[model samples]
Target: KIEEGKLVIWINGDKGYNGLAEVGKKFEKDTGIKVTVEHPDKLEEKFPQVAATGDGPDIIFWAHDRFGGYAQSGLLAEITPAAAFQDKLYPFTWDAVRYNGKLIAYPIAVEALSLIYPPKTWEEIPALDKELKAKGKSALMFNLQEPYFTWPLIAADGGYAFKYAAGKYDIKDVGVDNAGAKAGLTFLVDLIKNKHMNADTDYSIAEAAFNKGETAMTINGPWAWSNIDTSAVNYGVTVLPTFKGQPSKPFVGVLSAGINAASPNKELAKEFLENYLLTDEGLEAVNKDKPLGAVALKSYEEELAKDPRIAATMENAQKGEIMPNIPQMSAFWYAVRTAVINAASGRQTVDEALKDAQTNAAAAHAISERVEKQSALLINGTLKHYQLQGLEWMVSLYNNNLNGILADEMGLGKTIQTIALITYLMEHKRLNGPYLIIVPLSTLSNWTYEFDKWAPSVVKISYKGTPAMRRSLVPQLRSGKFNVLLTTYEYIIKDKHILAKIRWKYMIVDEGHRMKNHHCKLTQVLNTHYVAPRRILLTGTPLQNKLPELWALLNFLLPTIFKSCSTFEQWFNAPFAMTGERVDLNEEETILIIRRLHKVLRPFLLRRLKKEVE
Candidate 1:
């Protein structure tokens, strides 16, 4: 039910609440407008349901992508921007939140990838690119596991994914299959194959490399700076670099706030967003806390640009194309992602993957309609997809042997898949809870929230607290009252005796790459101390790094099949190894060997690139 108040604003936990709460306080103080801020565990899913029943918040804050769906469905109010508001915003910010030529949401922040480099590498074009080759230093580092990060590189080349301009999006125009886009994707394939950049690199490792001066530069946004203590590297930002004499333009997305079409106090909500939100107090409160993207307002850019970090990226955003916000943009993500992953894995050449992804994208356009015919993964909730293929892929993964490794690319919701897998197990009486999940400490809360939303049948706890609090949960944990227990690596080292008392039904490991070293303490616990009959390793490691790593994981899962390192190493490297490095093989020989290698691994490991799942 909708509660009455002067205004209620819905925000999300993207970065967790900071500037937003402070802004709401100032607005309440100045106008006595009694603002209530709601950050639901699943705001996006809940808001739509409440809005449909004519009971929802006045203002909702989210990314620009969802604005098109809300507006088109008539669930969002037509928030006509005032003359001052329209004039003050950065150009094209309007396009992000508008649909059918009508402004339906309030634009807030903008994000896109820009190049960050050592100033010297960019001094001269042809020579700089050549110098990196000679020096053997990386020209760029990015989260290759995520297709979104790779889009700027793809876009910087001659490829364009969508034919969106003005206010209309022609759903029919998909550029991923076109020759120009194919050429761009082909360039990416060669880069990964040659190891010019690591396709296995994730967001953490990419940012850490740049911060530690391991790589010359990276492509990311301001949010990466939160871990300042981890880095000592000096760098500057600029527009994406020229690829083969042609400049690259990054894909852009605007952060926006939408009004409820059914809101009773639209005037008060609009006035609060327009007048109070852009005021000095609100700006100071919000901008000071982790201001990653440049605010949508032009004047505010001047203020944040004093840091030089903001100024460089702000200057470059002009060259980017507004990321298409239409629902059809969902199809484009997979089309491009599948192409990149297929090429990187050597399953298909770049040109072939691009052609194949284009076909996938076209089929994705009909996803919503096709979904009604099956047991879809999630129609809505915390488990949602920009595309339906994600739902289907995840559903299939759940019903598998309940013991295979899930090695999807990073940012593709392996955690979500794991949650659904366990939940699916319970519904069919194949599995029971008191399941154990070992995740990195950083992802603790995210797992807590996701499992709570999708797997209500399981009790999800972070396994963190004071010593007394920790002591209290063990008996409960042992009793199986709590179905899911989450902890970090250190937990096993410190509390192995306590955890050893239980025989876990399932053991799931996130960032599974850490266990490649048998000497690692956690490896010893899983192998020597604790007993988990079924275990799944989740990782984003590339196929190139699969030999020893897969051997390490299989030793934990099924020690018999992949018995020892030396045995498997000799087995894996026999034809492929020349001396120590990758096999020096002709193109045809490489393709023939990779195909068989792919087949042997298929039974134990199910690996998908980011394109297949969200």
Candidate 2:
């Protein structure tokens, strides 16, 4: 699985790779192991793609947050830090790389949020605002929509994503909606109402305002200093001032170096990370321009303190807890983003928003366990073996808090598999159903009939008829009378008012390829208006060859991660005549590319042919 006497490493950027390159040279000289440090474009995206195939760089250098995903997906090898070296770094640095009590990576550096050009205390902000307003300026500004910038305010009291105890996070015990968190939100809201901080401020607006000296201070990290215009805005960095008699602590992030589970160079990689990178001289070389930020090594503390900027970051990180490293943390982020946006924009009260956030988080954190093969499902008719396999795939996807496309070939019982998944969740997982299934108008009756024939116990509602009929159904919809809501695609756009109010368990779309145009009205409505935490696209047709259309579906499934269309294009090497009658790739290259795509899609999609089944 690895080349003997040669170890490959993947790092994000040239600055990091250059620092590691020097360390690699030193490593090769000392250990006789050739070290090649590669600076890859979009290493975050490419590392997972290549690593999933059981062949990639022996060492992957990235932030600790990503290590949870890698370790959960079984990509990173379990590591035991050398005892002496482990004692050399801060305890929380080790905490950052820990996943489920195992150290899956080595900590390289730590960073946290801090106040730039800070006022002395929270009480000083109002007076500062009064003075600045006469000069047509503001006192403080930041991205009100970002939880990272605002977490210190939330955490100053006791706000937390999950409760940590005995070295483990109980995902079920979310505390973001507690009284302490409400106080945090109320403080920010009151500041907005008083105009001490602009409600409209985002990262761009805040950064520009501070750089132009319009605002005296902003909440940011050391990584943000590169873009700051130091000549224009004379600034100082320090830990955020205490609020409500408690210190403001931000989430600490660790830059990490982890080994691939599939690689045979585990011992070699361990030696390189411990004996070479963890040393004072090696860490000094690694931070040779401070490209890697605050050092985690205790011996380098004196040197770090000499630099005020880096020392402030270390001070903040000391008081902070490492960000929760769990798959369920994704649910927390998604819910909290909405909570902050809603509470900030006056769309919802603080209590209303946080309560909704807690509800959504609980619903989204489903257990991801595999069922090898079920002989019989709890339904009217039997599920074929292959359909059971499809159910298994769907169950696993939901457990991992992922949306997926169920694209089985036509006439292969995709409907049966889908129905079975709902039934399985209800009966086995103890999740009560409030699933929404959108189908073509012509087949609405057939879908309704199939639900009756298969899952008669599920309370179903058909939300269609004349205006008067829809009005009558509105009360029932709000009362939670139905377990499943079957509606046509047209209703999604027309009746979005009432439908969007209720949070859904899963939003299922039959003939999902109809949403190929992500810019269409229906797609926009689904993207912005609906609050479906998990989406399941049921289609019998193969997705078209056009790259953008494929990007649309992927974006719809996971919008946060698959943000930019251009980024997707770069990933697949698009504009290679993918729109042409023929692709630019030759037969061999085409097969290879398809395999690569399968690796990306395998977790999110499952398609099968009748002939391929046993």
Candidate 3:
């Protein structure tokens, strides 16, 4: 009933801080196992460095993707038959913990995003479809910036990103670029172009619009739980809508625990995992502690179903696809974002864009595989030699470019670097007046919190108000009262007329990669109207579906250098589009682009790894 040795756990912030400390204490008391739990502000930062040193925690509670670096480094102990336990666990839970061929972690919870529509919305869908037939509008709504979340619609229509062939993932099939993906893409485009759905509404703005009885339906996830005032709307959650014969599915993610390979007591850590982590007791402790729709322990489904939140979450998960935990999974984000945004914006056919994405994905996969094989620091021609240094350089480049492009690998600190750059600018008085930041509204609060925690002196103004209030506040922004204004791309379009009137000193575009398609209104507006002399575009995903995206982002930042679309197309886009066609940049050209940007932007941009700060 007791373990002789002690177990040290590195966890996210304290459960007590967020209502989960008692559960950890209880686990230690009940098991007679000595437990020391330490909370780290940045788990992603800590885990890698600790693992690199070959000394870390016995167990770590983090997102499935959080352990990619450790697993890739071979710093994780493979849990074999223990991984088969995933079959018994929730599908999402099992899927999120398995990376490559090993079961490196066990899930503690599940997260998913779905289309939550007011029951009244469905009644209107048929009529809206009919009305759209007459008016030529499509009855649909979703975000082009989020591909994982949008993949369900493709699957619902019986399309896929890659096909599993001959025992491996293959992109040659390019199923996502086929008829099904096109149909789904066309329907979404029709919704916006025809006005059946609001073109200017993104996820959070849509959620808020839905909550306030503006939109009949919206795509979102549990993160929206606290934001939605359920009392105001009669909402019902469902998988994303399907085409013809497909079933709607959502992107499902699992929150799991991984043993840090760097732990001094690797054997003890394995014991801790085998004894307590894989058991019903461990899972139960996690659930009772956090209650974030974690897959229930084998014996606790009934108990979980009893709770309304869990039940609703379970329903959502049923129509979900387990998110892939492989380190390569990060490569898909930007590609998908580009494809979806381009298709949604009417700049490219969904099939063409997805095909481009498939190609880029293959390139990314090649880079990842090569990195894994060589154990080299350079990935896809970009030097990731010094983890922290590479990140800092990328961040600095992004900030310096203002409207620049960042094509860094995932799990890198894009968010932190952006925050740091903003902090530095504010601290130095290079930015004295109020600024405007356009981002996904879901991340608005996160940005606010980060600013408060990391740069408290900077003031942020979020456009959270009733219609009348939002319209009224536009003038206040111009009056120079607030230092920063935060809103979503959708809101920018909705309130374009108001925003266009102001002349701000700086503009920051988070997930700036969304504007890769120059023809879209969002891109057009930012380039033409909100032309801040100082612009910063932040995205870990710069080369999403096509190399044109790289061109587009560069054009936004340095139109004079890249010249026109025709020039970029002939020089870069066309060659990158052809299969087996490789374009190599001369050393001088590469240096002129990458090195010059770094040199000019170093002072204005600062990107650092979590390890450097710690």
Best by TM-score: 2
Candidate 3, residues 1-614, lDDT tens digits: the string is 11236677777763422333444455467766566777888867777666665566677777776566568677676765454555566654655566675778766666677666633322236566555456543444455467765676666666665564442445445466667767766666665575565545566665555566655556777667556756467666654444565556666666667766545555665655555655666656655555556353555665666755566666667765665444445556667778878877778876788888776664412223111111121122222344335344433443333344344444464555455545545443245565778776667788777667655666677876688989778677867777778877777777777777777776777763344342345665666556466666666443333344545555556544543444443564354656766566665665455555454433333343435443
1-614, model 1: which lDDT tens digit per residue? 55555788888766435777777777788877788877788887788778877887888888888777778668888886668768888757887887888888888877766777743222243344446768766666788877887766576556776677566876657677665676666677666766666677888888877776667767787666556434555566677666656666777667788989887778887778888776555666676664646778777777887877667666556777777766666677867777787788788887788888776665522333222222223223554542234434434433332355566677777777677656655643335656888887778888887766656557666778788888977777767777778987777767888887777887887864444442245765667678777677777775543444544554656644543444453665676566677543455654655667666556556566656544
Ranking by lDDT: 2, 1, 3
Show where candidate 1 strays beyond 4 Å: 15-18, 118-137, 244-246, 368-614
Minimal lDDT window, size 10, model 3: 369-378
lDDT of each: 0.68, 0.79, 0.58
- Model 1 scores what on Cα lDDT? 0.68
Once superposed on the true structure, which residue ranges of model 2 sit more than 4 Å away at CA? 365-398, 401-614
Two-way TM-score contest, 1 vs 3, winner: 1
Task: Give all TM-scores, in the order shown.
Answer: 0.58, 0.63, 0.53
lDDT of 2 by residue, 357-380 (tens): 887675532444567644233566
Task: Work out candidate 1's RMSD over C-alphas.
Answer: 20.3
Candidate 2 vs candidate 3: which has greater lDDT? 2
Give me the displacement of residue 462 in model 1, in angstroms.
57
Instruction: Report the alpha-carbon TM-score of model 1 versus the true structure.
Output: 0.58
Best by lDDT: 2
Clashes of each: 1, 0, 13
